[PDB]
Every structure is written in C-alpha cells, then in structure tokens.
RNA sequence: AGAGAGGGAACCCACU
C-alpha cells in the first residue's frame, strides 16, 4: 500500500524516496536513472521503489466513515 | 501465539547462571563452558582465540539448538595447564586487542577528518 | 499498419476492438469451425516462404499466451516449467494473500486476508496488465538464495530473515466479521442486545 | 448513557437509545458505525 | 408486481452501470470489481457455467 | 465425481485456446472443473430468422 | 599464546558510509565485529506508541509499525540513556526514553502527507534524520486525523530490526581467493572484486597453503541513526563490554568452584 | 502496409483493445443481459 | 478478584510499559492480555500498575 | 515458522526457521537473502522457470525496468539474460559468493541468489494449531466434538 | 432410519466404534529440525500447556509435584487437575483455597507434559506401522511440531503444509508399552522388505556424498568444530591423514569417528564402473567408488544412497543389526548434525549455471534432433508409398507407429546420454543425482537436452480434431512435432503446441494420481 | 468467590 520505511533486506531508509521517485519519473527520466539518481546502488533497495504500487492513493478516494 | 518474546535472546532470569563450568570426565583436563543467552557472536571469537594457544589441545563450540539461546565451549588443554586459565586468558587477550583496535580506529578517524 | 495506428490512439479516434471486428480483420472462431481452419501460430514464421508447410492459412493466432487462463497468466516463463508445477501454481495463485479488493475497509467480509506492502513482480508478463495484477497484487519481491544451509530448508521448507520480517516483510492482517441479530417472536423467547 | 453512532453515508453523529429503531435524522440512513473507544490503546512498535 | 428477481452487478439493469470511477468511489464500490455476481442475503454468489 | 474413468477428465485437443490447459483443481475434480481462457468468449446466441 | 595487533586503514569517510581495512586479525574477530555492527550497536527507536485518535485509511498497528522503523538521531544520547527495563523510574522517564508527539488533522482538499517532520520531540537532540525529503508515515484525506504520543527507548538489533543502525555492512577477505576458500568452477566468468589487484589476463591468485585470512575490507553504510564511524566505535565498546561481563561471570564461577 | 517485425508490440495493442472493450467477465454480464 | 477486568500497566521487568487487561489474578501473580502482542503472559502483582 | 509461502511456480513450503540478519549469509556487498529455499526442490520438480525468473529478476532490478516474462517470446532466452546480467558486474549465471553468517568464512560453493516473487498463502499455523483434553463432548454419543 | 444410522461409514460400527474422536490429541503443521534426535518431536508450549499426563503422587516425586501444583495452571510447569483418592477432581485453573492443595501418597496430578514424555506421532494414511511411531517430547518455543529429517521417509511427510496428529498415552502402563514397542529406534527396519525405512534424507545425503570424497581436507579448526557435534565421541582427536605440510584431516576420518562400534560392510557407489572389478584396481579404486567400512572405520568409497539409504544391506541396516538400536539412533543424529555443520563450510546450491551445457553439446543435441526428425520424415514417405512392410503380428499402421516411436525413443536416449557427458563434475544436478538424494538422469536430460515424446494413454497425442492434433497442423500429419514430440528442453522453453501437449501429459499424470488414492485405500482396508 | 459448555442436519471451496 504505502511505501515501506526501510528496505526489507538492508534496512536502507527508502520511505523518503517515493515522492522524489515519482518526480523524477514525471521529469522524463528512465526508471534506472531515477533509481541511481536517488542513490540506490544495491538492487534489493532498487526493487523497493521499482516494484512498488502506491495503492493508498486508491484507498483515499473513499469518504472517511468516521467524521 | 507461541512466539518467544524478543528479549529471550540476551536477557537472563532469576535462577539462570550466565556461565556454567562442567568438568569433562572422558579425557583429562577438559571442561564444558555453558554460556547462557549468547550466540556465535561470542563463541566464535572465543574458539578462534583458544586455537592460538600452543597449550590448548581442543577448542570448539556449538549451539545445541538455534531456538534455545545457549552455547557450549569445550576446551581441552595440555596437562599442568588448566582450561579455565586458558579461557580467562583468551578473554583478556580479546579485550586487549579490541581496545587496541578501538584506539587505532580513533587515531584513523582523527587522521581522516583532519586531512 | 493503419489499424495499429488507429488503435494506439484510443480515446481520441474512438477506434475500439468492435471497430476492428467490423473491419473484417478479426473474427470469432468456435470449436466446430476450428476443425475446418488452417491456423497460423505466429505471422513472422508461417507466412514467409520456406520449404513450405501448407501455404494455405486461413486464420492466424493473435498471441499464443492467450491460450492460458487468468491464474496461469501470472506465471513467469510457464513454458519452462513442468505442467504439474503449472497446475499446482494455478491452485496456489488463488490463495496468495494480498489486497483482494480496493474497498476492503467498507466490506464486512468473513476471512479477509490483506497484506501490508504488496508489490508488483519484477519479472512479469504482458498479460498481467489486463488482469490488473499490478494494481491489486498478491506477494512481495524477495531476494531468495537457493542454498543448502543449517538444515531447516530441508524438505519443501524455506529459511526466512527475522530482520526483514521485523521490517514488515509479508506481515499480513486478518479480518473476521461476526454478524448477529435479535428475533422478535411470540413473546416466549426474545433476543435483545444488552450487557448481561 | 446514550451511545453515539456515526450515520454511515451522512458521516454525522447522533445519539441512540435502547430499543430504538436504527435511523439517522439527516436522511434516515439505516447503517450506523460505532465510534472509536475512549479507553487507551498502546502498541509495541514491533 | 410479479416478483423480485436478483441482479448481478455491473449489468445493464444494475445501479452502477456506466458510472465513472469517481462515482463508484462515492458509492463505496471499487472500479476494480468486475461484477458478474449476485448479492443474495448479503452473500456474493457466482453462477458456475 | 469419484469416477474411475479418465476420458471426461483428460485434456482434449479441442481445449486449445478456449480453456486453460494448466489451471484445474488437483483434488478429486481434475479436468472436470476448468477455468476459461483469457480471450475465449461464450456466444450469447441470436435468433436464426 | 596471545592476541595479534590489528591495524586500521580508512579509505574513505562520508556522512553515509565508512570504508576501512582491518589487518592482522583473525577471521572470527572480523566476523563478530560485523555482527556487532548489525546487532549489538544500541540506538534510539520508537517502541511505545499510544494512539489517541486515528481516522486514516491505515489501521493503528500499521501506523505503529511504520513509526517503529523511523531512524532517530542518537549520536550522543544513546550512551547516556539507560535501558528502559533497567531504569528505576515510574515505568517511563527522560532518562530512558524520548517523548514524541504527533497531532495532525487534514483540513484541506489536498492529500496531506503526515511525514517524519510532524514527529515533535521534547529532546532537541533526538529528532528524525530527515537535502533529502521526509519519511512518509501516512497520507490523509480531508476529515481524517491521527493523534499519538510515542516513547522511544534504547535497544539493539537482536531485540528488533528497528534498532539496527546499519543500512549495509559489506565484508570480504581475500578478494582474489589466494586461500581458495571458495572454489570457482570456471574462474574466467567471475568478475573481479573492487579490491582485486590482478591484471585482466589473470583470473584468480595462485594458491598458498601457509596463508591465513587477513586484511579484511569493510563497507559500513549507516541508515542515518548514527554516524558511520560512531557505529564502529560503539560496536567495539559493546563487544569489549560483553567480553568484560563474561569475564566477570567467569571469575565468579571460578571462585565458586574453588 | 504490413507489420514486418514490430509485430511483437503490435499484437499486444490489440490485446489491450480487446480487454478494454470487452473485459474479463463479458460472459456473465452479456448472458444475464440477454 | 478485584483486579479482574482492569487495565493494568507493567511497571517493572522485561515487559515494562505494556498495557493489558487482567484475565486471571491470584494472591501472587496475574495473567495479563497484552494489547500489543497476540499473547497473554503472567506477571507478579507487584509489577502491575493500574490506569 | 509453519506459515505457508509459495513461489509463482508451485514451489510452496512452510517457514522452517527465521534467522536474524547477522546470522543470514551475505554477498560481497551487504545483501542478505530474505528467503533461503531448498536446492533439492528444483531437480525433480523441474521448475527451471523459477531459476530463469530469479535471473531475470537480477537483470530487472539492476537495469531499472520491470522484466518481461511472456511464455512464447523467442526474444528473451537465458543467454540474452546472462549477457545483460554480465554488464552489471555480476556472474553470467547469477551465482554470487555468499559469506557465511556464523563463521564468516566464505562458502566454498557459489550460491545462486537473486530476487523472485513470493506469495504468502492464506494458511498460517495459528489457524491450524489445536490441542484438546477432556473438553466438550457430543450428546448423541459421549464422544469428543469435531473440529 | 436405524439401519441408515448403522450401515454407513459415518454410522455406529465404523464411524463411532472403530474410528472415534479421542481426547488428549493435538494437530499442527510440522517444520523440519535437524538439531534433535530421530525419536524427539518438538511440540509447542501452548500444546504442552493443554495436554496433561496423570502422574501418581509418590514420595519420590511428592515435592516436585507439590511445587507444580503450587504453580497452578498457566504457569507452564504447573498442573490443572488434582485427583483425590476417591476419584474427586479438583481444578487448578480456578484457583481454589490453598488448604486443599496438599499432596499425600495416592493422589493423581494431571500435570502439563514436559520434556521426556512419550507421544504417538502419526500421519493420516497409516498404510504401515512406521506411519505411527512414538517420539520423546522436547519443548521448543514456536507453534509447530519440530520433528527430525530422517523420520520423513517412513511418514512420507514433506513439510509443505503437512500437519500431523499427536496422541498422548495417559496411563503409565501404556507409556511403557509405547516406549518398549513403538519407538522409532525400534521401528528402523521394516518387516515388509527386511530393510530400513529411515535412511538419510536429501540434503544430508548430498552433503555427506561430497563430504566423504577423496579430495576433501579439513583444517584443524574445522575439524574441532565438526567433532563438537559428535554425541558418541570419546574426546580423542584422530591422527591426521596429512601431518607435515598443513595438518589436514580427511573427511573419511571424521566419518569413521561417526561410524559406531566395529561394523564391516562393502558397498558400491552409484557411479562405480562395472568394468572396474574385472581388471586391476579392484581393491584400490581410482574413482573412490568402492565403499569399504572396516572395523568400524571408513576405509574408502563415497557413500551414496546405496550406502546410507533405505536399501537392504546398507551401512545403516548393518549398524542396526550388528550394533543395537539406540546406537543406530545416535548414528543417525551424528550423521545429520555433523554433515550439516560441515555443509555450512562447504555450502550446496543449484542454479541456472547447472542447467546450461557448452555450445558443442548443444550442437550435438540439435544435430541428433535433426537427424532423427529427417529419419522420421523418410519413414513417413516410405509408409505413404506402400514401401513400408508390415511387421509379422500387427498392422501396417503399427509397424509405422513402432518405427516412429523407436526412432524418437532412440533420439531421446542418445540426446540424454550426450547431454549427461558434459556436467564437468561440478554440476549440482549431477551432485544430487549421483548421490541419489533427489532426481535422476532423466531430469537432467529433460532440463538440458530435450523433454522427449509426450504420451496420452501410452501412445502419442491423438487426433482430437478431424485427423489433426491441433488446428495449426495440416491434416494427416504423423510427424514428430505434430504428434506430440517435444524437441525443446526446459532451459530453452516450449513452443505453444509443445506446451499444450506437455500439459496433456501432465494432466494424464495428475489424473492417475487423483484416481489411484481411493482404490488403493479400499484395497488396503479389505486386506486388513 | 454464586463453576459449564450442547444445537443438529444438509451442501460448496480449498488443504496434504
Ligand atoms: Mg506435504
Ligand atoms: Zn446523517
Ligand atoms: Zn526510566
């Protein structure tokens, strides 16, 4: 759903990279260029953003039950 | 449900001895050192240091089970030399070399950060 | 090529699949008609001149990957596997935990299995784009190592990483609903919700 | 003594009574959602 | 009035036919749901061919 | 179910492209219960007039 | 019969990682130092989360989990903090904990990102690490909110992975396997390591039977909770402390036997 | 003209068109509709 | 007992800081249903502090 | 442990044990496995696609693109995958020198490693574990209950 | 009706009198554990804290049982029921007054089971007596039944979601009966084929096959680490096989330390040449493929599944007969522990590099496929022109079918042989096949060279359509590819028509597996 | 300090 805070294998802090990753994607970069522009050398840290699906944006369309 | 609490790896309890010495009876001058609430991150170094003594005839360690936090270090030394003395010398040698390593790392940090 | 040009620019030309059916390019062939059709597998091989096989093709398969089902389409390289393994994966694929629906917070489903951080597969098929498996995935990409070890991955078992699990690796959440209503009856037994 | 329920589609809150038919006052929506408990919750961050 | 007959979702006689995804999210129904199932006593039923 | 014969359960040649060859319940319902292929479509039928 | 003298040669020192070489020491000592990097280094991480209110799409325990893995600046406080279970306080105090407060309600049509910046500490030193953007905790729709008080306590990597200060600890010895510990079937296909010193004509170094593992290469990349060099300093101090306590119990047992 | 070797990316365009036009459950919905 | 069904807080020991509900209680010990973990553990009454 | 995980190739299996990061093996870099599977699960089941998925996973995660795994392609075979992997400083066939997590001595064999896609199945062990001792008893006959 | 209530498999006679629900039983998933003995099962605490053993209060255990009663229930060592002399039950879970918690000689205490208690462990299809054996309880934290590796073979449990049933003998008399009859040390050799059923399982077998090779040498530190795990080691480090340059123990010396007592066996390795015992070197094996264990010490040979497996006359069978049965239990435990702990140093894997042959082998495979395909085509053109003559005993079509199947089978065998001559002795497929732990030569041939002919009901793929197998083939096409022969391998991947025919073969296999079970079970029930 | 439990039958999906 939401981006994990840490890479599962390393523990590298990847939760702060997602919005910048989207910004680099919409700035006409390739996904690999965006990944190592954010500074992710190990591929286990690269799969955290390369294969993430931001489902919480789908979850936010519904009106909150409690109000 | 049956998940052991996370502090079972390193925290002892009332009635638990950190180290237990049992004199081996199969061969002369041999002892089993049962260390409670430890893992390879102690026994491996202890075994490596005990292999550097010219008076230790056997230096090994094993975990009975990875889910139960205890190790047994078997030490057989040459006669006239107690295995407990070898153990307490290995610990002191490890402390000495680690303190020297820490001081040299401090010196290296001072060299690197100040050019 | 003009069909592809008009088909790439959808939502602009309003050129749909039905327009291509109306164009006399594709048509639906049933099982009876397959007995009387010469079917080309792929055009890059079965329409160029060679030592000719038949040279009398009537229809051409769109893509061979469309012979598979919904659960056999999420298997990467299914032709490299063995068929019983593909069948067993087809059985397991309808069982993987994941976000089964987008509005799961509203649904009072019994036995709702959802996942913390589902991921799309790094190794995917083209058919997952049409099952929308990249939008409601089921599973996490994991750095696996195929190694003999201490002896706990012995007979169809796997050794996991405790630190990774502590970082939210496959940590799921299980919802279970309980329904109950009272019954207004002929005054002999009358259920009512109250603190006993 | 009255229990406060959140009125489903309305997302507003209202009181309820024992042996009271479940109805909202805004549009009579039948589905009520009970408010979150007032007692403390503590979660180990593990 | 003859009687009530069940309707499978996403039909031409269901309420949410041709509704946009925003309208579906307003109805607490996801656009991802393919429909094709009946709601009988709150239980989702699938007619196996 | 529980029939010792195999012809109603086997993967016939005419299952190509219409029904998935791999997906099936591997219990006592092998081949009997099947899953439709992706592009396969069941003709809803029209009048012959 | 005694310990060899090790030496340290640091190749680079950055705010993220430290790369150094330890020579003239045993393999078990080197591996333990790496394991103490991963596990035995104590840092400050959130462990006690009290959710006052929550209306977000993510449930309470999911938010508490995400608050756990957030790194905290513990460069000098972790040496002063006692372990929470060891303190004689009334089950919480500023000597074994750091208080954090989050109070966010979304009152706008834009999706409001509750990031790590909204975590407000009472201790100015212990703050979330986040040039770089903040760590996204939870997104909020209009009308949703979350209020919580989080206590962070001292702990190390054995207890939980949220007390792990290292992003990655690369460790390798004998990059051209002159010891031949690993046996390549076809060494031509194998890429050379970063520390290889053989010409491109040669694949692997000749074997020597009298050699031993030495000159260990480390690449300790921190996650931001600690500076990469204080991870090593705390690790060496922690390993020495563990051996000292083991010696103290050893002395007690020996005196008990005699 | 024809698609000589860009057919690999041309076939999946028509697959996408089919599944955007029809969908995965046309059998159930069309059968109940008729 | 009086402690049954009372939200308690372990104020001493390895489980310090955990909020739970007392399921069973004795003169010596009491079982606490932890709100965080999926586990019920027993601790001394001297280590418990009610809310 | 006991929780039932599975690959995308019918390679199911329960969790045998969970080691911490310091006990798990590691490469020349700091990468440790998340899952360690049995080498003996491959040869008789013959899931070579699992190995190819792992190899393509390494290529995809290094290249920075979601790899393609359509069955009948002829544009992607194992040799092309190996040639693409070789450019990123790895072995041709995905093998990588793992260092032992306990002793630190590098493993003599070269362990095949890389990212696959694993699925957690609905079957836990908490949902299946149950014991009983003179509990509820049926009324038709005085035998224990079912389930 | 009453007759319907009695006549069924869910009635009174079978469903209630023969097989009935029983108290004191647990059912949970099993996960492997190689660090406990073969007669030990690792049960969870929550299971042990719910199943009780009625221990009689005697002056020997009165203080221990008193302390357990003082703990009460849910203090795991404690108990839940205390039974009076007149059969009166007193609860310990409801915390009675401390006055009636005394113990005098004669009381019963239903205490939570601890380590060393005996339980019955069984899987469901109890087709033989080794599918239901007695184990000793070991309390391990997590919530699974941790049982050993070698007990998998008699149970046929492959840990992939398997859950087992664990019964607890309540009486002391039946506890001794299970200990003296149904112990897994006492159920090593089966009576059905006078051979062991335990054997050595896959990973330990491969690691011990690589361990006992001639070129395996161990440093002193590694030797001490390995010898630490021997339960039957008398504390004497053996003299090294290499003294002066780099004191280096051979793995056979450590395995000789494993081998108990003084047993003598002569076995042959799986890859022992049959022409080796004819000429010279019949006693000094150049390939080290002649297993000789002599005076309790492994002289030579590499131990494959024909040495340590379930085959009759193996090392374990002789260890059971010449030595005791407790000694064989120690033998199994020592093998598993020390070989696994050496496997940590060695390491064993499998990968895509083990499934790829060099280009010369691929050229040989493709040349063989092309030659066989052209041979089939020319046989077809002979059959069309009536130049094929019928074999005496069958029709002309079958003389043709026999010729085509013979050619394709010859192609499959030749390609498989040419593929399995190019493993280079480090291929892990060969490592598992030679040891016999998992797989065979056919799997190597299908992965590397060619899958082979696909069959349905013992013959080729039938003409489901009108005189053609698939709509992509011309009518009346009796060629290799049209009729189901797959010339590709699992490494290269299958074409869609070959994929469909391969799915047909897999479907036939699954149908056989799914239909066989009920008939076999009914035959077993009638026989018993 | 007040201490036991009940439903029952039918039919679907999987699990080894
Ligand atoms: Mg099984
Ligand atoms: Zn309202
Ligand atoms: Zn304090």
């Amino acid at each position: 759903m939401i981006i994990p805070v840490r890479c599962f294998t390393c523990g590298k802090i990847v939760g702060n990279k997602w919005e910048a990753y989207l910004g680099l994607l919409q700035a006409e970069y390739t996904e690999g260029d965006a990944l190592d522009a954010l500074g992710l050398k190990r591929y286990c840290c690269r799969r955290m953003l390369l294969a993430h699906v931001d489902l919480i944006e789908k979850l936010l369309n519904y009106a909150p039950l409690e109000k | 449900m049956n998940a052991p609490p996370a502090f079972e790896s390193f925290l002892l309890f009332e009635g638990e001895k950190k180290i237990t010495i049992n004199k081996d009876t199969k061969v002369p001058n041999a002892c089993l050192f049962t260390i409670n609430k430890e893992d390879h991150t102690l026994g491996n170094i202890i075994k490596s240091q005990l292999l550097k003594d010219p008076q230790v005839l056997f230096a090994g360690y094993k975990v009975p089970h990875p889910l139960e936090h205890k190790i047994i270090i078997r030490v057989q030394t040459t006669p006239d030399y107690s295995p407990q003395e070898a153990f307490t010398n290995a610990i002191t040698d490890l402390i000495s070399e680690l303190s020297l390593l820490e001081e040299r790392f401090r010196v290296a940090i001072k060299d690197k950060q100040e050019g | 090529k003009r069909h592809i040009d008009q088909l790439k620019e959808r939502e602009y030309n309003n050129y749909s699949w039905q327009d291509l059916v109306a164009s006399g390019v594709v048509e639906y062939i049933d099982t009876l008609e397959e007995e009387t059709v010469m079917l080309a597998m792929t055009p890059d091989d079965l329409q160029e001149k060679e030592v000719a096989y038949c040279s009398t093709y009537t229809h051409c398969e769109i893509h061979p990957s469309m012979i598979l089902g919904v659960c056999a389409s999420i298997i990467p390289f299914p032709d490299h596997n063995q068929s019983p393994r593909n069948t067993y994966q087809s059985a397991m694929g309808k069982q993987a935990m994941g976000v089964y629906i987008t509005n799961f917070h509203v649904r009072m489903d019994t036995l709702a299995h959802v996942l913390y951080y589902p991921q799309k597969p790094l190794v995917t098929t083209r058919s997952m784009e049409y099952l929308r498996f990249r939008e409601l995935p089921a599973g996490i990409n994991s750095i696996v190592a195929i190694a003999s070890y201490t002896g706990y991955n012995q007979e169809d078992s796997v050794i996991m990483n405790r630190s990774a699990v502590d970082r939210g690796f496959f940590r799921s959440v299980f919802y279970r609903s309980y329904k109950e209503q009272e019954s207004k009856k002929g005054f002999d037994q009358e259920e009512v919700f109250e603190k006993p | 003594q009255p229990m406060i329920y959140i009125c489903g589609e309305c997302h507003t809150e209202n009181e309820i009574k024992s042996r009271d038919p479940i109805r909202c006052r805004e549009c009579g929506y039948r589905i009520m959602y009970k408010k979150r408990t007032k007692r403390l919750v503590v979660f180990d961050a593990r | 009035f003859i009687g009530k007959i069940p309707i499978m979702l996403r039909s031409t006689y269901c309420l949410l036919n041709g509704l946009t995804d925003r309208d579906l999210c307003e109805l607490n129904e996801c656009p991802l749901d393919p429909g094709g199932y009946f709601i009988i006593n709150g239980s989702e039923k699938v007619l196996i061919a | 179910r529980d029939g010792k014969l195999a012809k109603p359960r086997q993967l016939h040649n005419t299952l190509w492209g219409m029904v998935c060859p791999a997906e099936t319940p591997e219990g006592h319902a092998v081949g009997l219960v099947k899953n439709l292929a992706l592009m396969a479509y069941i003709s809803v039928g029209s009048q012959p007039s | 019969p005694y310990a060899n003298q090790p030496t340290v040669r640091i190749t680079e020192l950055t705010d993220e990682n430290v790369k150094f070489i330890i020579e003239n020491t045993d393999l078990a000592v080197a591996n333990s130092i790496r394991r103490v990097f991963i596990a035995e280094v104590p840092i400050i991480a959130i462990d006690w989360v009290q959710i006052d209110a929550n209306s977000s799409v993510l449930h309470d325990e999911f938010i508490a989990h995400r608050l756990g893995l957030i790194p905290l600046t513990s460069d000098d406080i972790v040496d002063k903090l006692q372990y929470s279970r060891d303190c004689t306080c009334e089950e919480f105090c500023p000597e074994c904990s750091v208080e954090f407060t989050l109070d966010v309600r979304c009152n706008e049509d834009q999706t409001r990102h509750v990031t790590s910046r909204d975590l407000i500490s009472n201790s100015p030193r212990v703050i979330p690490v986040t040039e770089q953007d903040d760590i996204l905790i939870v997104k909020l729709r209009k009308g949703q909110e979350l209020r919580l008080r989080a206590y962070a306590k001292k702990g190390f990597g054995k207890e939980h992975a949220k007390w792990n200060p290292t992003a990655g600890v690369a460790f390798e010895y004998d990059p051209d396997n002159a010891l031949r510990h690993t046996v390549y079937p076809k060494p031509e296909e194998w890429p050379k390591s970063e520390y290889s010193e053989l010409d491109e004509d040669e694949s692997q170094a000749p074997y020597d039977p009298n050699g031993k593992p030495e000159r260990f290469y480390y690449n300790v990349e921190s996650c931001g909770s600690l500076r990469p060099e204080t991870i090593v300093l705390s690790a060496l101090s922690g390993l020495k402390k563990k051996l000292s306590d083991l010696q103290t119990q050893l002395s007690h047992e020996i005196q008990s036997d005699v | 003209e024809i698609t000589p070797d860009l057919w690999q990316e041309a076939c999946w365009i028509v697959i996408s068109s089919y599944f955007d036009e029809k969908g995965l459950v046309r059998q159930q919905l069309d059968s109940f509709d008729e | 007992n009086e402690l049954i069904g009372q939200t308690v807080r372990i104020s001493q020991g390895p489980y310090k800081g955990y909020i739970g509900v007392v399921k069973d209680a004795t003169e010596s010990t009491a079982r606490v249903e932890l709100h965080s973990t999926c586990q019920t553990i027993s601790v001394d009454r001297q280590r418990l502090t009610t809310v | 442990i006991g929780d039932k995980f599975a690959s995308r190739h019918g390679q199911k299996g329960t969790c045998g044990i969970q080691y911490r990061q310091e006990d798990m093996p590691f490469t020349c870099e700091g990468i440790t496995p998340d899952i360690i599977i049995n080498p003996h699960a491959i040869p008789s089941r013959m899931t070579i696609g699992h190995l190819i998925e792992c190899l393509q996973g390494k290529v995809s995660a290094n290249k920075g693109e979601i790899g393609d795994a359509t069955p009948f392609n002829d544009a992607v075979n194992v040799q092309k995958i190996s040639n693409l992997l070789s450019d990123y400083g790895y072995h041709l066939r995905g093998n990588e020198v793992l260092y032992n997590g306990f002793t630190g001595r590098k493993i003599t064999s070269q362990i095949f490693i890389g990212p696959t896609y694993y699925q957690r199945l609905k079957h836990m062990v908490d949902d299946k574990i149950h014991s009983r001792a003179r509990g509820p008893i049926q009324i038709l006959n005085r035998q224990p209950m079912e389930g | 009706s009453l007759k319907q209530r009695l006549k069924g498999k869910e009635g009174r006679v079978r469903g209630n009198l023969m097989g009935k629900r029983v108290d004191f039983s647990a059912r949970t998933v099993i996960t492997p554990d190689p660090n406990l003995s073969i007669d030990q099962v690792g049960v969870p605490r929550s299971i042990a804290a719910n199943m009780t053993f009625a221990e009689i209060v005697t002056p020997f255990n009165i203080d221990r049982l008193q302390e357990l009663v003082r703990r009460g229930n849910s203090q795991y060592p404690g108990a839940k029921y205390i039974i009076r002399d007149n059969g009166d039950r007193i609860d310990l879970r409801f915390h009675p007054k401390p006055s009636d918690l005394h113990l005098q000689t004669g009381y019963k205490v239903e205490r939570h089971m601890c380590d060393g208690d005996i339980v019955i462990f069984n899987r469901q299809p109890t087709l033989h007596k080794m599918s239901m054996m007695g184990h000793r309880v070991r309390i391990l934290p997590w919530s699974t039944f941790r049982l050993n590796l070698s007990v998998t073979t008699p149970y046929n449990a492959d840990f992939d979601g398997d859950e087992m049933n664990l019964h607890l003998p309540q009486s002391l008399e039946t506890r001794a009966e299970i200990q003296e009859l149904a112990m897994v040390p006492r159920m090593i050799v089966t009576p059905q084929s006078n051979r062991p059923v335990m054997g050595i399982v896959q990973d330990t077998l491969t690691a011990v096959r690589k361990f006992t090779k001639r070129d395996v040498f161990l440093e002193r530190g590694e030797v001490m680490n390995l010898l630490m795990f021997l339960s039957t080691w008398d504390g004497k480090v053996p003299q090294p096989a290499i003294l002066k340059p780099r004191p280096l123990w051979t793995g056979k010396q450590i395995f000789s330390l494993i081998i108990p007592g003084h047993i003598n066996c002569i076995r042959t390795h799986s890859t022992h040449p049959d022409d080796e015992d004819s000429g010279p070197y019949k006693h000094i094996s150049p390939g080290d493929t002649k297993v000789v264990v002599e005076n309790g010490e492994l002289i030579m040979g590499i131990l494959c599944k024909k040495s340590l497996g379930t085959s009759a006359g193996s090392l374990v069978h002789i260890s059971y007969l010449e030595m005791g049965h407790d000694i064989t239990r120690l033998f199994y435990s020592n093998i598993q522990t020390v070989i696994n702990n050496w496997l940590l140093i060695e390491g064993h894997t499998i990968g895509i590099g083990d499934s790829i042959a060099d280009s010369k082998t691929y050229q040989d495979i493709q040349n063989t496929i092309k030659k066989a395909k052209q041979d089939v085509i020319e046989v077809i053109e002979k059959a069309h022109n009536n130049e094929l003559e019928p074999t005496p005993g069958n029709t002309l079509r079958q003389t043709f079918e026999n010729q085509v199947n013979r050619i394709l089978n010859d192609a499959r065998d030749k390609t498989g042989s040419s593929a399995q001559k190019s493993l280079s002795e480090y291929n892990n497929f060969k490592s598992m096949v030679v040891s016999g732990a998992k797989g065979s030569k056919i799997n190597i041939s299908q992965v590397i060279a060619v899958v082979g002919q696909q069959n349905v009901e013992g013959k080729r793929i039938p003409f489901g359509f009108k005189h053609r197998t698939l709509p992509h083939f011309i009518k009346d096409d009796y060629g290799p590819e049209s009729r189901g022969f797959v010339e590709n391998s699992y490494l290269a991947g299958l074409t869609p028509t070959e994929f469909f025919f391969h799915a047909m073969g897999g479907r036939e296999g699954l149908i056989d597996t799914a239909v066989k079970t009920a008939e076999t079970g009914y035959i077993q029930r009638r026989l018993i």
Side-chain angles (χ1 to χ4, degrees), chain K residues 123 156-162:
Chain K
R123 215 158 146 280
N156 195 8
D158 52 351
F159 296 108
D160 58 356
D162 283 329

